[PDB]
Amino acid sequence: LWQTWLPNHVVFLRLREGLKNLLTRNVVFGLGGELFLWDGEDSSFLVVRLRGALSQYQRLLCINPPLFEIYQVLLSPTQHHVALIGIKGLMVLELPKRWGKNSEFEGGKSTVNCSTTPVAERFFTSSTSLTLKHAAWYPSEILDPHVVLLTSDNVIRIYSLREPQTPTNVIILSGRAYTASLGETAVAFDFGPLAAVPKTLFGQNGKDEVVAYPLYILYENGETFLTYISLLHSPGNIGKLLGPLPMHPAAEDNYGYDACAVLCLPCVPNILVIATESGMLYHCVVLEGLIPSLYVFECVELELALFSCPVKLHRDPKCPSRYHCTHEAGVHSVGLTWIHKLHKFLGSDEEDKDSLQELSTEQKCFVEHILCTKPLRQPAPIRGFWIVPDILGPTMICITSTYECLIWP
């Protein structure tokens, strides 16, 4: 079983020896029965076959490598492309084809060249100080791959791989100056699940229902915005941005500032997880309004479940009610056992808020510190996190700052 021998595979020795020679890091992703590990020093992927030896791996080389550091790697919805995400750029790698009885890339050659294409290359060279804050794929598994980029200019741009230098859609959310509104800028976003929406939502007609995905956008000051995206029917310049979503109930501390991460759990009504650098996790029910609102069902303080570090949120492939949190102290698992009690009809009127409040007094989420990376001297964040989905029990892979491969359970 790979859960036993994977921590001893030579790829981790290779990566570890590469150390001796900001975005949160995730240098690993899984596909099929294979694990992909980004080797920054060689600008290539190390591919280990988990299903079907400690020295065997394939190296997937970038024909044209990125010169900026890769912080995160992200497999596309159709699983034919990988986004190579850095602070100073984004590059998309096309995976090669497989063949042979073992379904190895290009028949099991030790080394395979992969085509790459830079994205939005103009914006990162023209404006030297322009940085990438967050990136993800448009969730569709049917359309051409589209990447979604949030840059430090507080603008979101969508690019087709067919025209990687020209946005298909722009979302203006609205440093030379001294400013007090330093937190009125987006730090992250996340797509919600597929939804059918009236075509009238995008200005067209027919009373017909079209595919769209809700896009939730998080400001540093904790404010949240919402817009629905349809690559076919959305306008080139999207202006129907809803928010800031009112956050209920009123909190004495106004839910603070310094929000750093957002996650939309795949449920209806949508539920947002908002994380802060201080370790606060807010679980927010999105209540339908035309502006929806948020009901903070509960809050979790990770500082108590063990703190001024960036927090990264991960969905669970099996259960919409569970997610995971990675930080300098390790990994927390959070189970929202109350998700299944919320019905699809919920609304934003007063009686619904009172029912949610009453329900929150008899329901609590389950939080567990499953992996501890705390040192003996300076704590270091993990470099990789992946949940291998097996129906017989999810296996979690966590790559430490020194490229140790921790496996849980």
Partner: protein, 150 residues
């Protein structure tokens, strides 16, 4: 006027533009100590010590907005540190209040601002930009902070 240009509505100087004219000497040089330039209702910039305002286009150099201020629009047309208006200064921005995430109203109550320690938030917002927080006045939302230069 002997050199200085300031015409944008709402802007002013202490001493006034008229006073600066009379301060100009025989050879046409306007040197003043503790000079202030402000925009009524939005903020002001206090320059302690002597500064040479001779032939400065304050309309093009100084920009005061709500919760924001700019001095010299681009770095190329900026003098070195210590010369011109690119020097130590005390900035005051008015109408600086946080927004209630529930009601979406501005929080102006001193007790409410002490509850959420908005003062400590402004101290952090100052350091992150290379400034030193000095004080905050709730009644007018006046955020005062010192900058080493612009």
């Amino acid at each position: 006027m002997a050199g200085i240009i300031l015409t944008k509505v709402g802007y002013y100087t202490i001493p006034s533009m008229d006073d600066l004219a009379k301060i100009t000497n025989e050879k046409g040089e306007c040197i003043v100590s503790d000079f202030t330039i402000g925009r009524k209702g939005y903020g002001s910039i206090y320059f302690e010590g002597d500064v040479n305002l001779t032939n400065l286009n304050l309309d093009d150099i100084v920009h005061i907005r709500r919760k924001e201020v700019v001095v010299y629009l681009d770095d190329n047309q900026k003098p070195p540190v210590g010369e011109g208006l690119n020097r130590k200064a005390e900035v005051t921005l008015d109408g600086v209040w946080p927004t209630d995430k529930t009601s979406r109203c501005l929080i102006k109550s001193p007790d409410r601002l002490a509850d959420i320690n908005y003062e400590g938030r402004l101290e952090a917002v100052s350091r992150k930009q290379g400034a030193q927080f000095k004080e905050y006045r709730p009644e007018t939302g006046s955020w005062v902070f010192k900058v080493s230069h612009f």
